[PDB]
Design a protein around this nucleic acid. Structure first.
Lengths: 62, 72, 66, 930, 108, 111, 89
RNA sequence: CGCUUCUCGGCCAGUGUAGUAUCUGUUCUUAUCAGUUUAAUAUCUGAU
């Protein structure tokens, strides 16, 4: 923990730990960004960072 | 612990053996079998005076005149 | 399981589960000859116009997602 | 960094150009290559000072060489003098440190805490507990690392393995294990491994191209696991530069890599890449590779290549015409492999390939030539025997002229070809008989060949197929005379060949005189056997069982040898002759040579006192097969004599005995079984009981089935009462087989008898025997099926008790009982109870304990078919949406299992559901009322 | 006539933490010219050192006689150093200048 | 009656060579036929057309005398129709006629 | 490391070796053979002609399914030709 | 080998792969708020 990190899809947000990121992924706001973005929730998109790549991934989904 | 001689003959069965008469004669062939009197069955036996004959088949060798048995 | 449709998981939305069972209702109705004929009798159409209608309602039922 | 990487390559070869040219003009005029302090800060890790002792010190150093010759020749010698110590150096480990390994584990020569990363490295020496130590250490440590996957992260790990998976002195066992760690952590890390991927393959790829069969298959396994694990574009962007890498080795292997990654991610993903490569115009070396890739794809993906076949080929054609040779060579070679996965398919996809090929065939000298054959040959099966007809007729020539080469690559090829060319339906018999054979048997059948492995096989095959056509006596006639050629492997070869042939074609063709030459042969071989090998033995057996009553005049000579051999020659060869009887039993029978059956019966009977296991085994075997021909009541050692004579053997410890014995005892206690007074049996019982210590399955297998046979002979109560006592100390499921007795027994008289004994015996306070009785019911219902419609009631309350806790195991095993019952009863109408039980089952749903869970899944699946869904689904509604995760996890897993089967049924059983604003969840249909 | 694994480097251990480059350079100095040396100066690597010569066969003569050799009250672990491994802390870059240089003077 | 398992629609060639079979959704398989050595009917091994999330209205044998055979899968995708929160893709999708093509020599089946 | 291929179910009869010989494949069991095994020649081909559907030896017999797996209808899923972690072939 | 004596008897610490269960020892019920997280807690992450 207390190590510099950033999530791109969430407000270019900063995270201080790598364990923290998994928790952020199973999260209210993270899923709100996905689902409201048009990228549906749960477990295929877990490894997301940037908004762009998961868009082509979701085109691969549907 | 003692090694019995008949046991020594028993294990040389199916091997090559030299049989040395009390005379100047000798036979080498495969030891097929023996009895308590040490009569002896040889197979394809060379007969020597110390080469007389090449035997083909089975020889009963009378234990009577046998002096020495030699495995190999 | 996944490539077998109708699979759920614990993230399953209300909407999806129900649309599933709609569709399956349908491939049954196309299936079971009688049941079909039942519908036909009630609301007067062809057998066909029935099946056709159904195969329209397939993707829709309940209307758009949320 | 990638662009950087390749930059470093073009570097490397630019360098080799500079040097090689420097000795090109220097020759017109390695590891020892001198070094730079940047290069010197490149090797040793972090954390070391360079020194100076002195410019006078380092001056003597500078003086060293010049004074290494100089003071190499000068004065010295060394003199010892005759005349509170300390400092015990700390070395070794729980699994201990070999001397060499110090270099790795050195930091376990320090003893400290309070250093943080370095506490993770210094904690990752858990490895050493992987690499060396005790098996249990290896185990536990191994998991401890697995769950520590996510945590330490790859980087530290592979930093700390790859040295070891590179260890100049690493052990094979150590290799394989450290692979195990690489897989296992690679079940976890996914996105993670990216920066490491090449930094993995470099170790692994050598392993993939592996002499050991199990080595390879591991390798492939993990290269998939990586490649799929990482991303495609990862794999590619990684692995270009190894294509043009100077060393042919790294290319070669690099291919087989791409083969694997392609099996992972599918061809069509990867095609445009390949197809790019084979059109690379910089240099060929690539293309040599890219083509190779096509091949190893071929080999691996095999029968499944089929769909993109056309595309693949559409790559590879542009090779065949190339200016460089190899590229031709390898290319064609691939076409071959393709077709060999193509089999009789996709012919015209290869189509545009041929017309060069045929022409190419003409003009060649050399390895390439025969390669093109390797292809064409694998083609022909794919053509139309009119078109194939023509083209065939052209080849069989060049084939002819080419038998004779010294090349072995060749002889393999031309060989396999003939299999196909003259391996055809649309080719004419005589023609082979004339042109080919006499060469064939001439140049090929020679002692060069058979000593080698492959050639041995490939040969046998080929000759066989020439039989399948030109007939039998033709071949066999020519190779009979060689059973009496001395050297073994050769003989072995002719022998097996024949064996097959009279396998396929049948004996019926063979003449007479030739036949005398057979049996005279097949003895003469059989009489001299270096080892005992299945080959000559089987080969014989087939010989006889084919000849049938043509064989009969020959027995006395056989059984004569059979005995003579049988005796002496000291015991090693004995078991062989024994088997020989085993297989020829049937022939000694139907022809009705009974004096023979007197002979065998009784004289075998004597050996059963033989002390060597490996004889006595084969001995019994012979007895068994002797029984299967002559019935009981005609047995010349009439059973009364025999069966006890066996009885004491059962101690024998050694394997082959226990096998053939229990087998025998079984046959006889099944069939005759009256011959022997009861008392004897019950001795047999109390002797069987500990055959259940068998490490092996098959023993216990037939063991049980016997236990049944006698249980029939006597009657049940005792034999279960006796089984009730047995298997007390069986370890971890070893006793179960006893339970299996309780089962089979419980059939073989009306189980309807036995229960009360059993049920009552669940009273006993001793826990593990309790659960034992539960399984007893399990296998019990599995074996009874329909009949359960009765005793169900009996068990149900008991299932209630056991199913209620004492401990898991109760619930596990019991639940299994519910399963097999629930299937067996199906649809006779006893549901009600089963509903009742469903309750006491149900709560068990939740647990992590893998056996308990996959048990329960067993239960509810079966119960579904018994109760029907609708009831089930009425346990599974509430669960779906329950707020918590835990529950939803499961109730979903259940509802799936309900769902896949009987999806067709459900429709009825979704309840009504009220429609909201944006949607309609009410299915209006069903309420249409006429 | 040599095993391939051994290399111009030797790992060298069982050292005191007082001990002198003077001692070191001298002793090791026998077999041949020193490419150079390193000494672990760090919390862990205090106690060990690396040694590298202008030739391997130098070092061969070394691990030969110096095997288990004594200093003070201690027998020095004398080993042929492994390689590859963790170095890539550096990078291979810095061809360009040099290989242009051979490109230049000799013209070759 | 399933949603995904064939037997619903059934089609077969003029020349009888091969026969295609299909569920309503997702699965279309094909069995090839040739009379045996003695001209008694031997059945091939199956094949697969799989295409995800595709509704098959109706299928019909096609006519090509002695060719690689064709079939007509009347289809529609609903996948557009799900991922359209609005309800536009509800309309403005058209059912897609596709001819699949058996191919013997290659022995797979290609859109 | 060891799991099904589940490629499509062809007409090719299954093939089992000495070892595997009794076993109803998925229920692991000897009980009540009734019905018969089919796998894809993709799974079953060539060197796999009469190969074990488990261990990689020559098939001496033909796996029969249990009845248990029958009424639970599993025999009709993808071809049970077990693929190990390494390439099958 | 035969005879005699005595004693006894029979008949009318293996191994391998995967996985769970259960004791004991050691640390915490202890200041606020902000995020991650959970069915809710808990737990984890920052500063006074």
């Amino acid at each position: 923990l207390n190590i510099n990190y950033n999530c791109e899809i969430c407000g270019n947000y900063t995270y201080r730990g790598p364990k923290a990121f998994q928790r952020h992924f199973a999260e209210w706001r993270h899923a709100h960004g996905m689902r409201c973005l048009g990228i549906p929730n749960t477990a295929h998109f877990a490894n997301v960072t940037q908004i762009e790549d998961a868009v082509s991934l979701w085109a691969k989904l549907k | 612990s003692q090694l019995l001689p008949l046991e020594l003959v028993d294990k040389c069965i199916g091997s090559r053996i030299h049989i040395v008469m009390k005379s100047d004669k000798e036979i080498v062939g495969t030891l097929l079998g023996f009895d308590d009197f040490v009569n002896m069955v040889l197979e394809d036996v060379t007969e020597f005076e110390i080469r007389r004959i090449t035997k083909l088949d089975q020889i009963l060798l009378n234990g009577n005149n046998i002096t020495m048995l030699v495995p190999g | 399981q996944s490539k077998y449709i109708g699979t759920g998981h614990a993230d399953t939305t209300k909407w999806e589960w129900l649309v599933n069972q709609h569709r399956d209702s349908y491939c049954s109705y196309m299936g079971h000859f009688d049941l079909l004929n039942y519908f036909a009798i009630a609301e007067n159409e062809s057998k066909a116009r029935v099946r056709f209608n159904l195969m329209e309602k397939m993707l829709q039922p309940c209307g758009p997602p949320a | 960094e990638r662009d950087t990487p390749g930059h470093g390559s073009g570097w490397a070869e630019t360098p080799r150009t500079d040097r090689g040219g420097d000795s090109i003009g220097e020759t017109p005029t390695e590891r020892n290559r001198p070094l730079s302090d940047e290069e010197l800060d490149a090797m040793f890790p972090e954390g070391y000072k360079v020194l100076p002792p002195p410019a006078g010190y380092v001056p003597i150093r500078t003086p060293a060489r010049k004074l290494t010759a100089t003071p190499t020749p000068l004065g010295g010698m060394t003199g010892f003098h005759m005349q509170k110590s300390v400092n015990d150096q700390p070395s070794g480990n729980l699994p201990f440190l070999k001397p060499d390994d110090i270099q790795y584990f050195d930091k376990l020569l320090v003893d400290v805490d309070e250093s943080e990363e370095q506490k993770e490295r210094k904690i990752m020496k858990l490895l050493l507990k992987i690499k060396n130590g005790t098996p249990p250490m290896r185990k536990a440590a191994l998991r401890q690392i697995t769950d520590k996957a996510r945590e330490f992260g790859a980087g530290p790990l592979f930093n700390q393995i790859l040295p070891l998976l590179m260890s100049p002195t690493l052990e094979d066992q150590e290799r394989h294990l450290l692979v195990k760690v690489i897989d296992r952590i690679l079940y976890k890390l996914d996105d993670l491994v990216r920066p490491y991927v090449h930094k993995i393959l470099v170790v692994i790829e050598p392993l993939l191209i592996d002499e050991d069969y199990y080595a390879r298959v591991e390798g492939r396994e993990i290269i998939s696991n990586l490649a799929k694990a990482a991303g495609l574009a990862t794999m590619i962007s990684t692995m270009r530069p190894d294509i043009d890498n100077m060393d042919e080795y790294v290319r070669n292997t690099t291919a087989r890599a791409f083969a694997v990654v392609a099996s992972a991610l599918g061809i069509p993903s990867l095609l445009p890449f390949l197809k790019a490569v084979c059109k690379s115009k910089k240099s060929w070396q690539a293309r040599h590779t890219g083509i190779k890739i096509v091949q190893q794809i071929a080999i691996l993906m095999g029968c499944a290549i089929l769909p993109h076949l056309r595309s693949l080929v559409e790559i590879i054609e542009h090779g065949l015409v190339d200016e460089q040779q190899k590229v031709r060579t390898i290319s064609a070679l691939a076409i071959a492999a393709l077709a060999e996965a193509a089999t009789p398919y996709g012919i015209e996809s290869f189509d545009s390939v041929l017309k060069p090929l045929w022409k190419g065939i003409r003009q060649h000298r050399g390895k390439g030539l025969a390669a093109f054959l390797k292809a064409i040959g694998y083609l022909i099966p794919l053509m139309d025997a009119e078109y194939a007809n023509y083209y065939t007729r052209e080849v069989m020539l060049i084939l002819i002229r080419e038998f004779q080469s010294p090349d072995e690559e060749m002889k393999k090829i031309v060989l396999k070809v003939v299999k196909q060319c003259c391996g055809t339906d649309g080719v004419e018999a005589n023609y082979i008989k004339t042109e080919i054979l006499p060469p064939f048997f001439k140049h090929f059948w020679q002692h060069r060949m058979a000593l080698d492995r492959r050639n041995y096989r490939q040969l046998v095959d080929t000759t066989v197929e020439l039989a399948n056509k030109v007939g039998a006596a033709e071949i066999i006639s020519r190779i009979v005379d060689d059973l009496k050629d001395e050297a073994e492997q050769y003989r072995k070869m002719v022998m097996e060949t024949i064996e097959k042939i009279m396998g396929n074609l049948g004996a019926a063709d063979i003449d007479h005189k030739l036949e005398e030459q057979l049996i005279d042969g097949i003895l003469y071989a059989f009489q001299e056997q270096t080892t005992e090998d299945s080959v000559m033995l089987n080969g014989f057996g087939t010989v006889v069982n084919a000849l049938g009553k043509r064989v009969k005049p020959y027995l006395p000579q056989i059984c004569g040898t059979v005995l003579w051999r049988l005796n002496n020659k000291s015991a090693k060869v004995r078991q062989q002759a024994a088997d020989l009887i085993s297989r020829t039993a049937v022939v000694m029978k139907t022809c009705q040579e009974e004096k023979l059956m007197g002979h065998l019966g009784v004289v075998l009977y004597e050996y059963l006192g033989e002390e060597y296991p490996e004889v006595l085994g084969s001995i019994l075997g012979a007895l068994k097969a002797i029984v299967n021909v002559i019935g009981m009541h005609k047995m010349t050692p009439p059973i009364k004599d025999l069966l006890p004579r066996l009885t004491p053997i059962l101690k024998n410890r050694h394997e082959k005995v226990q096998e053939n014995c229990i087998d025998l005892v079984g046959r006889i206690a099944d069939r005759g079984a009256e011959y022997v007074s009861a008392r004897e049996w019950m001795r047999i019982c109390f002797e069987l009981l500990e055959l259940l210590k068998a490490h092996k399955k098959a023993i216990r297998r037939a063991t049980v089935n016997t236990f049944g046979y006698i249980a029939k002979a006597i009657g049940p109560h005792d034999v279960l009462a006796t089984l009730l006592n047995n298997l007390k100390v069986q370890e971890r499921q070893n006793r179960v087989c006893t339970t299996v007795a309780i089962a089979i027994v419980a059939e073989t008289c009306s189980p309807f008898t036995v229960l009360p004994a059993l049920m009552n015996e669940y009273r006993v306070p001793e826990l593990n025997v309790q659960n034992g009785v539960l399984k007893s019911l399990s296998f019990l219902f599995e074996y009874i099926g329909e009949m359960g419609k009765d005793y169900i009631y009996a068990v149900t309350p008991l299932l209630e008790d056991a199913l209620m806790d004492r401990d898991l195991v109760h619930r596990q095993t019991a639940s299994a009982v519910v399963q097999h019952m629930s299937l067996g009863v199906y649809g006779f109408g006893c549901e009600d109870s089963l509903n009742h039980l469903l309750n006491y089952v149900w709560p068990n749903v939740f647990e992590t304990s893998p056996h308990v869970i996959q048990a329960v899944m067993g239960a509810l699946e079966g119960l579904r078919v018994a109760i029907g869904p609708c009831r089930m689904l009425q346990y599974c509604l509430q669960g779906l949406f329950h707020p918590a995760r835990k529950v939803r996890d499961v109730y979903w897993k259940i509802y799936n299992s309900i769902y896949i089967g009987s999806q067709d049924a459900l429709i009825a059983h979704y309840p009504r559901i009220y429609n909201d604003d944006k949607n309609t969840y009410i299915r209006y249909e069903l309420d249409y009322i006429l | 006539r040599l095993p391939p694994e051994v290399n111009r480097i030797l790992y060298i251990r069982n050292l005191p933490y007082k001990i002198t480059a003077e001692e070191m350079y001298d002793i090791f100095g026998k077999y041949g010219p020193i490419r150079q040396i390193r000494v672990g100066n760090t919390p862990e690597t205090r106690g060990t050192a690396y040694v590298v010569y202008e030739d391997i066969f130098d070092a061969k003569n070394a691990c030969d006689h110096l095997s288990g050799f004594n200093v003070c009250n201690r027998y020095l672990v004398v080993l042929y150093y492994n390689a590859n491994r963790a170095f890539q802390k550096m990078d291979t870059k810095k061809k360009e200048e040099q290989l242009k240089l051979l490109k230049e003077k000799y013209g070759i | 009656c399933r949603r995904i398992v064939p037997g619903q629609f059934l089609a077969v060639d003029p020349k009888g060579r091969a026969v295609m079979i299909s569920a309503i959704e997702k699965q279309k398989l094909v069995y090839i036929l040739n009379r045996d050595a003695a001209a008694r009917l031997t059945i091939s091994s199956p094949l697969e057309a799989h295409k995800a999330n595709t509704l098959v209205y109706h299928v019909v044998g096609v006519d090509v005398g002695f060719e690689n055979p064709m079939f007509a899968c009347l289809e529609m995708d609903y996948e557009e129709a799900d991922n359209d929160p609005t309800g536009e893709a509800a309309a403005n999708t058209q059912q897609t006629l596709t001819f699949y093509e058996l191919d013997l020599g290659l022995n797979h089946v290609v859109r | 490391d060891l799991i099904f291929c589940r490629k499509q179910a062809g007409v090719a009869i299954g093939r089992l070796c000495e070892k595997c010989d009794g076993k109803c494949v998925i229920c692991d069991s000897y009980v009540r053979p009734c019905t018969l095994v089919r796998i894809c020649d993709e799974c079953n081909y060539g060197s796999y002609q009469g190969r074990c559907v488990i261990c990689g030896g020559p098939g001496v017999s033909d796996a029969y399914y249990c009845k248990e797996c029958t009424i639970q209808e599993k025999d009709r899923d993808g071809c049970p030709k077990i693929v190990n972690l390494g390439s099958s072939k």
